[PDB]
Amino acid sequence: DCQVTNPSTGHLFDLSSLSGRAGFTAAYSEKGLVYMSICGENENCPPGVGACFGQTRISVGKANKRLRYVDQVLQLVYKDGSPCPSKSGLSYKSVISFVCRPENRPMLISLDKQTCTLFFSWHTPLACE
């Protein structure tokens, strides 16, 4: 269960092929990484957590299957992560954006320290048309 349709074309986008507890990794810092699963928890993270830092297993967002379609982009937003070290009261959240790739792994493109939001991009043919 990982899909969404284009509101004006009826086209159905299905990312179920990327789902699974095994998940993937995104390069974080020098040699560190972030473990993440699509539309579900990751086996390398705490129960119910969809993305986490590899060194600590600390959560950067609880998994969910709420895939949204926004201006040709497919997006997932994992919220309710662990406490933000850069701002009191906030929790980590992860934004995963799928963009069409005419023709491998997600990329952490930005870490907003003021809102503790990790922005990832994933160019895949699964998001085309």
Secondary structure (DSSP) of 32-66: EEEEE-SSS--TTSSTTBSEEETTT--BS-B----
Each domain of the chain, given as residue ranges in start order, spans: 1-129
Question: What's the fold here for domain 1-129?
Answer: Cation-dependent Mannose-6-phosphate Receptor; Chain A (2.70.130)
In whole angstroms, what is the distance from residue 87 CA to residue 52 CA? 18
In whole angstroms, what is the distance from residue 16 CA to residue 36 CA? 14
Solving technique for this entry?
X-ray
Backbone angles phi, psi at 110, to 5 degrees: -160, 140
Resolution in A: 2.0
Instruction: Tell me the Cα Rg of the chain.
Output: 14
DSSP track, 67-93: -EEETTEEEEEE---SBPTTSTT-B-E
Contact in structure between 94 and 115 (CB atoms under 8 Å): no
